[PDB]
Amino acid sequence: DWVVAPISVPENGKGPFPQRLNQLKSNKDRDTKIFYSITGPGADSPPEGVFAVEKETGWLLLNKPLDREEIAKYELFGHAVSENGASVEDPMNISIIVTDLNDHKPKFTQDTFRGSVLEGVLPGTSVMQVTATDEDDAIYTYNGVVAYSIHSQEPKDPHDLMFTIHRSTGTISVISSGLDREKVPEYTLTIQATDMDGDGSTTTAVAVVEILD
Amino acid sequence: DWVVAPISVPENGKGPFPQRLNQLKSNKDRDTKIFYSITGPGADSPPEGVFAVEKETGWLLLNKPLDREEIAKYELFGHAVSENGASVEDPMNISIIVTDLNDHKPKFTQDTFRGSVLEGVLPGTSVMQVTATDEDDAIYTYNGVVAYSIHSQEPKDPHDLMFTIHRSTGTISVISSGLDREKVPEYTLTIQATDMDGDGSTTTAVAVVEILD
Ligand SMILES: [Ca+2]
Ligand SMILES: [Ca+2]
Ligand SMILES: [Ca+2]
Ligand SMILES: [Ca+2]
Ligand SMILES: [Ca+2]
Ligand SMILES: [Ca+2]
């Protein structure tokens, strides 16, 4: 059977609303006046009335901007009923596919991460790992893809940047010699996550690294 | 049966082309890979290839700006065939409705119309009738609706405008006294037709009126 294709709708639309998506039509409007309706979540169940159909034209309508992070897919049914009150078609499925916009900054799992490392480990040594997530799509886009960076380190002793961070994994490492617990026993690193694998929104957190004895 | 609604497409589109109109879809792409095609005038008969369908996505495409005055309606069929070569749906009808833009100026039937009238008829007297047509729509719009006016008269004797014209019918009348064959035996009137019932494009012609004795 010939059916309506999934309808792709990007989130956060300007409208104007209501917005025509597609026009349902039964063949039998030849012999009969037809009344179209729609059921399902987003229509007649929660959230009600996000989608509506014009009773006589069969225009399916979107009534407000969508949010993919709330609902990414609606599955509705279209109905066709004659003036005399008889269902004249089996209900048809209709799918609405909400597509992504980069509308989330990344978020660090904690605001402050704590880890530690021994003085005198070789440069190259893994210290700890940080994590930030991103609500947006990261399959088809870089909207959800986070890149990690270190913005600054305190104090600047012995040298000004002793650590680096692995840009996709969040793993912090020692890249320098001179960690000495007795002179600088702890460090605070401002760390950053930027979605669009680097090119996007930036979020900030702290990593506090203890120098073990 | 649920079918594709007529697709309204205004003429003279900017594109970009090719332009997605609507997405055909068979249910049976569940169990089977489907190949979509389209037949009919505008597809596989003259004018070929104004419309095309993407073999696998089933996107129906318009490939160039349309002209309503050339063809105002296309009637095509959609086809669905399995990978193994079997038609798996009865062909479906598809209608394309080309809608109007005001892209024609009105045109006078002749460049010079000739008529005559007796001297000394009462003011109010019908002299002749002019006609201009307009290719555009005039049912739903004023694109096709012409309004007539007189731009000027030569000579300006006795008085400067002796005639008027009925704005919707093109009928010219005498609105003044003093027509005297012996002093001014003929007049030339520049006449105008403007579509959008007055507000639109203007075309010009001539009416030559003989004064009878
Ligand atoms: Ca969102
Ligand atoms: Ca998003
Ligand atoms: Ca994001
Ligand atoms: Ca045209
Ligand atoms: Ca036109
Ligand atoms: Ca016109």
XYZ file of C-alpha atoms and ligand atoms in Angstrom:
432
model
C 0.000 0.000 0.000
C 0.925 3.573 -0.804
C 1.382 5.493 2.382
C 2.609 8.831 3.657
C 6.385 8.967 4.053
C 7.898 9.849 7.382
C 7.805 13.660 7.630
C 11.109 15.234 8.682
C 10.749 18.455 10.720
C 13.697 20.285 12.162
C 13.327 21.341 15.780
C 12.999 24.934 16.897
C 11.088 26.155 13.805
C 10.117 29.836 13.222
C 6.768 28.839 11.693
C 4.454 30.600 11.119
C 2.233 28.228 13.004
C 0.186 26.423 12.329
C 2.364 24.833 9.730
C 1.272 22.687 6.902
C 3.192 19.440 6.792
C 1.351 17.261 4.433
C -2.135 16.714 2.929
C -3.998 13.578 3.643
C -6.468 12.449 1.059
C -8.783 9.568 0.558
C -9.908 8.516 -2.931
C -13.442 8.264 -1.899
C -13.857 11.985 -1.630
C -15.027 11.273 -5.205
C -18.390 9.967 -4.172
C -18.519 11.311 -0.658
C -17.646 14.275 1.473
C -14.813 13.225 3.797
C -13.917 14.281 7.342
C -10.248 13.731 8.321
C -9.009 13.261 11.824
C -5.759 12.276 13.671
C -5.074 10.171 16.847
C -1.910 9.431 18.889
C 0.562 10.986 21.225
C 0.959 14.614 20.072
C -2.694 14.763 18.857
C -5.333 13.335 21.122
C -2.990 12.065 23.958
C -0.132 13.780 25.709
C 1.102 16.194 24.568
C -2.306 16.926 23.088
C -2.696 19.170 20.114
C 0.918 19.457 18.957
C -0.378 18.213 15.577
C -3.855 18.796 14.172
C -5.555 18.012 10.840
C -7.920 20.345 9.030
C -11.257 18.497 9.048
C -12.068 19.012 5.337
C -8.881 19.785 3.482
C -6.959 16.990 5.222
C -3.986 19.291 5.802
C -1.874 17.933 8.653
C -0.595 20.790 10.725
C 2.215 21.351 13.235
C 1.041 23.891 15.855
C 4.284 24.888 17.634
C 8.081 24.708 17.516
C 9.330 21.115 18.290
C 12.121 19.977 20.643
C 13.980 16.844 19.663
C 15.460 16.378 23.078
C 11.941 16.073 24.480
C 10.379 13.925 21.767
C 12.239 12.835 18.676
C 9.525 10.907 16.888
C 5.688 10.951 16.866
C 3.603 8.171 15.555
C 0.092 9.201 14.693
C -2.815 7.812 12.742
C -4.891 9.460 10.081
C -8.569 8.730 9.849
C -11.107 9.197 7.146
C -14.837 9.301 7.813
C -17.815 10.017 5.469
C -20.428 12.637 6.079
C -22.841 9.924 6.975
C -20.537 8.769 9.816
C -18.805 5.657 8.407
C -15.044 5.019 8.649
C -14.154 4.580 4.904
C -10.404 3.784 5.287
C -8.222 1.817 7.610
C -6.279 4.275 9.649
C -3.005 5.213 8.283
C 0.254 5.610 10.103
C 2.010 8.822 10.032
C 5.494 9.467 11.406
C 6.981 12.652 12.337
C 10.752 12.747 12.641
C 12.132 15.594 14.615
C 15.713 16.434 13.416
C 18.548 18.024 15.417
C 19.799 21.493 15.879
C 22.868 22.152 18.082
C 20.837 23.715 20.881
C 22.705 22.135 23.860
C 26.066 23.170 25.250
C 28.037 20.358 26.666
C 27.726 19.741 30.387
C 30.401 18.377 32.680
C 29.249 15.395 34.785
C 30.776 17.086 37.951
C 31.741 20.762 38.429
C 34.965 19.683 40.183
C 36.846 16.459 39.431
C 39.564 15.195 41.760
C 42.372 12.931 40.880
C 45.965 12.475 41.912
C 49.365 11.402 40.628
C 52.782 10.578 42.014
C 55.648 12.972 41.798
C 58.207 11.798 39.421
C 56.102 9.694 37.072
C 57.392 9.879 33.497
C 56.031 12.581 31.191
C 53.274 10.829 29.373
C 51.637 9.419 32.409
C 47.836 9.225 32.722
C 46.552 11.095 35.789
C 42.733 10.947 35.608
C 39.764 11.321 33.252
C 37.094 13.956 32.873
C 33.713 13.674 31.155
C 31.172 16.067 29.716
C 28.046 14.954 27.858
C 26.049 16.703 25.094
C 22.325 16.189 24.500
C 22.499 16.884 20.770
C 22.922 14.449 17.945
C 26.394 12.960 17.563
C 25.719 10.165 14.992
C 25.002 12.222 11.932
C 26.402 15.520 13.283
C 29.161 16.986 15.512
C 26.451 18.685 17.610
C 26.761 16.059 20.291
C 30.563 15.544 19.834
C 32.656 17.066 22.601
C 36.308 18.242 22.437
C 38.345 18.734 25.598
C 40.931 21.388 26.264
C 42.763 22.862 29.277
C 42.212 26.633 29.641
C 44.811 27.345 32.370
C 46.612 25.931 35.394
C 47.326 27.278 38.895
C 49.869 27.676 40.146
C 52.422 28.108 37.378
C 55.113 26.196 39.292
C 57.488 24.763 38.376
C 56.393 25.279 34.736
C 53.247 26.860 33.429
C 51.609 23.813 31.894
C 52.471 20.458 33.363
C 49.379 18.672 32.077
C 47.562 18.128 28.865
C 44.217 16.457 28.138
C 43.306 14.006 25.385
C 40.884 15.938 23.195
C 38.332 13.174 22.623
C 38.717 11.003 25.731
C 39.063 13.628 28.511
C 42.067 11.724 29.989
C 44.549 14.157 31.633
C 48.227 13.345 31.497
C 51.570 14.686 32.776
C 53.545 16.156 30.000
C 56.344 17.577 32.001
C 58.969 16.844 34.623
C 59.277 18.615 38.030
C 56.158 17.569 39.930
C 57.327 17.914 43.531
C 54.765 17.407 46.325
C 56.775 19.434 48.779
C 56.807 22.573 46.521
C 53.334 22.302 44.867
C 51.168 19.634 46.335
C 48.039 20.425 44.429
C 46.967 21.879 41.104
C 43.751 23.278 39.785
C 43.148 23.129 36.078
C 40.295 24.928 34.333
C 39.100 22.482 31.761
C 36.810 22.967 28.791
C 34.387 20.993 26.625
C 33.369 22.411 23.262
C 30.728 20.651 21.101
C 31.030 20.512 17.289
C 34.249 18.725 18.035
C 35.969 22.022 18.819
C 34.187 24.524 16.634
C 31.093 24.998 18.890
C 29.654 26.062 22.299
C 32.120 25.883 25.264
C 31.445 24.714 28.827
C 33.938 25.013 31.745
C 34.758 22.963 34.881
C 37.655 22.344 37.317
C 40.025 19.458 37.832
C 42.045 19.353 41.055
C 45.068 17.157 40.955
C 46.866 15.992 44.139
C 50.644 15.313 43.916
C 51.392 12.056 45.828
C 54.481 11.689 47.933
C -7.746 4.387 -0.665
C -5.287 6.882 0.749
C -3.637 8.739 -2.057
C -1.360 11.684 -2.701
C -3.209 15.002 -2.750
C -2.982 17.239 -5.765
C 0.306 19.156 -5.437
C -0.025 22.915 -5.954
C 3.058 24.576 -7.501
C 3.167 28.224 -8.393
C 4.560 29.005 -11.826
C 7.862 30.743 -12.407
C 9.642 29.287 -9.339
C 13.214 30.269 -8.287
C 14.014 26.697 -7.218
C 16.677 25.561 -6.581
C 16.010 22.754 -8.986
C 15.511 19.996 -8.770
C 12.796 20.623 -6.267
C 11.321 18.167 -3.902
C 7.555 18.103 -4.124
C 6.489 15.071 -2.290
C 7.744 11.617 -1.187
C 6.143 8.542 -2.526
C 6.277 5.483 -0.362
C 5.027 1.972 -0.503
C 4.437 -0.048 2.676
C 6.182 -3.005 1.322
C 9.566 -1.403 1.588
C 9.281 -3.300 4.900
C 10.046 -6.654 3.399
C 11.547 -5.537 0.132
C 13.768 -2.953 -1.441
C 11.579 -0.747 -3.649
C 12.297 1.091 -6.903
C 9.976 4.056 -7.639
C 9.220 5.393 -11.055
C 6.826 7.912 -12.748
C 4.956 7.892 -16.137
C 2.830 10.493 -17.992
C 3.033 13.735 -19.847
C 5.789 15.758 -18.126
C 7.743 12.566 -17.216
C 8.127 9.949 -19.888
C 6.055 11.706 -22.675
C 6.139 15.267 -23.896
C 7.428 17.375 -22.300
C 9.724 14.649 -21.021
C 11.572 15.020 -17.784
C 9.805 18.042 -16.294
C 9.153 15.796 -13.265
C 11.365 12.946 -12.088
C 11.321 10.601 -9.070
C 14.388 9.526 -7.134
C 14.595 5.763 -7.716
C 15.143 4.778 -4.052
C 13.953 7.584 -1.837
C 10.724 8.035 -3.813
C 11.143 11.816 -3.782
C 9.121 13.335 -6.616
C 11.032 16.198 -8.114
C 10.232 19.240 -10.261
C 13.220 19.953 -12.555
C 12.497 23.474 -13.880
C 10.326 26.569 -13.468
C 6.698 25.896 -14.672
C 4.460 28.026 -16.925
C 0.748 27.836 -16.279
C -0.139 29.366 -19.587
C 1.585 26.451 -21.312
C 0.366 23.616 -19.100
C -1.800 24.156 -16.064
C -2.144 20.602 -14.828
C -0.078 17.382 -15.124
C -1.433 13.994 -14.433
C 1.221 11.427 -13.726
C 1.421 7.963 -12.262
C 3.684 6.651 -9.568
C 4.994 3.136 -9.762
C 6.502 0.822 -7.244
C 8.620 -2.172 -8.202
C 10.601 -4.676 -6.037
C 14.247 -5.443 -6.462
C 13.310 -8.738 -7.961
C 11.357 -6.954 -10.739
C 7.693 -7.305 -9.678
C 5.185 -4.420 -9.694
C 4.025 -4.464 -5.998
C 1.402 -1.648 -6.178
C -1.216 -0.463 -8.580
C 0.004 2.750 -10.049
C -1.052 5.788 -8.283
C -2.286 9.021 -9.738
C -0.510 12.144 -9.031
C -1.692 15.625 -9.990
C 0.289 18.658 -10.297
C -1.600 21.937 -10.261
C 0.242 24.865 -11.655
C -1.045 28.138 -10.042
C -1.033 31.653 -11.530
C 1.273 34.563 -11.352
C 0.393 37.828 -13.160
C 3.024 37.341 -15.851
C 0.955 38.560 -18.866
C 0.168 42.141 -19.792
C -3.128 42.576 -21.447
C -3.170 42.562 -25.232
C -5.542 44.469 -27.470
C -7.271 42.285 -30.095
C -6.383 44.924 -32.825
C -3.749 47.700 -32.655
C -6.217 50.135 -34.273
C -9.998 49.952 -33.862
C -12.305 51.952 -36.118
C -15.777 53.025 -35.358
C -17.976 55.982 -36.138
C -20.789 58.106 -34.748
C -23.176 60.778 -35.949
C -22.689 64.395 -35.129
C -25.236 65.591 -32.750
C -26.098 62.375 -30.935
C -26.928 63.017 -27.277
C -24.122 62.904 -24.711
C -24.297 59.399 -23.421
C -24.364 57.755 -26.764
C -22.490 54.494 -27.425
C -19.971 54.837 -30.269
C -18.092 51.509 -30.437
C -16.404 48.836 -28.312
C -12.799 47.877 -27.765
C -11.394 44.617 -26.403
C -8.152 43.482 -24.837
C -7.595 39.989 -23.442
C -5.296 38.781 -20.623
C -3.811 35.281 -20.433
C -3.632 35.217 -16.640
C -6.151 33.894 -14.192
C -9.278 36.003 -13.748
C -11.499 33.606 -11.699
C -9.642 33.591 -8.433
C -7.484 36.674 -9.144
C -7.517 40.095 -10.881
C -4.471 39.000 -12.919
C -6.624 38.320 -15.932
C -9.109 41.196 -15.238
C -8.697 44.166 -17.553
C -9.650 47.828 -16.903
C -10.044 50.282 -19.768
C -9.115 53.930 -19.801
C -8.584 56.693 -22.388
C -5.078 58.220 -22.220
C -5.621 61.196 -24.577
C -7.510 62.451 -27.617
C -6.454 64.278 -30.799
C -7.357 66.819 -31.756
C -8.578 68.776 -28.748
C -11.454 70.357 -30.695
C -13.998 71.486 -29.809
C -13.291 70.273 -26.239
C -10.403 68.230 -24.979
C -12.239 65.049 -24.069
C -15.404 64.275 -25.953
C -15.384 60.552 -25.221
C -15.155 58.250 -22.295
C -14.857 54.457 -22.117
C -16.679 52.009 -19.857
C -13.952 50.624 -17.611
C -14.984 46.961 -17.685
C -16.757 46.644 -21.043
C -14.488 48.708 -23.352
C -17.559 50.491 -24.842
C -16.679 54.086 -25.880
C -19.321 56.754 -25.558
C -19.850 60.460 -26.330
C -19.890 62.461 -23.205
C -20.001 65.858 -24.722
C -21.786 68.097 -27.192
C -20.164 69.786 -30.252
C -19.236 66.903 -32.547
C -19.258 68.615 -35.941
C -18.094 66.617 -38.986
C -17.237 69.729 -40.924
C -14.795 71.025 -38.221
C -13.327 67.702 -36.928
C -14.309 64.725 -38.964
C -12.147 62.201 -37.231
C -10.635 61.537 -33.827
C -7.864 59.339 -32.589
C -7.985 58.190 -29.012
C -5.105 56.440 -27.261
C -6.756 53.783 -25.203
C -5.387 51.647 -22.399
C -5.955 48.257 -20.771
C -4.505 47.614 -17.331
C -4.777 44.152 -15.694
C -5.378 43.755 -11.936
C -8.526 45.669 -12.669
C -6.586 48.934 -12.794
C -3.716 48.383 -10.413
C -1.488 46.357 -12.825
C 0.461 46.208 -16.142
C -0.743 48.649 -18.880
C -1.070 48.020 -22.623
C -1.890 50.723 -25.240
C -3.788 50.838 -28.570
C -5.637 53.336 -30.817
C -9.284 53.934 -31.562
C -10.167 56.076 -34.581
C -13.630 57.484 -34.559
C -15.294 58.888 -37.720
C -17.886 61.695 -37.282
C -20.869 60.945 -39.598
C -22.634 63.684 -41.464
Ca 16.085 21.031 21.574
Ca 19.245 19.605 19.681
Ca 25.705 20.546 21.472
Ca 3.331 32.055 -17.344
Ca 0.294 33.702 -15.429
Ca -2.177 39.913 -16.502
